């Protein structure tokens, strides 16, 4: 298919980088104490 490299970069972004960052931000926000 075209851009054979692209899944190899996007999949780790959405299954590892984005989940870790989103979970860290969510856990910071639910404990933000003063929003």
């Amino acid at each position: 298919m075209s851009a054979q490299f692209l899944p190899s970069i996007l999949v780790p972004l959405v299954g590892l980088v984005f989940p870790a960052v989103a979970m860290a931000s969510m856990f910071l926000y639910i404990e933000k104490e003063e929003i």
Partner: protein
Amino acid sequence: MPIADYQVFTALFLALATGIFAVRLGVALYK
């Protein structure tokens, strides 16, 4: 004729713009 790389990149960039619109609407809803 498979779609070329620049089409993929234009699509991804427009998706980023749409994501920006989405986050604006989300923070509006949270308010």
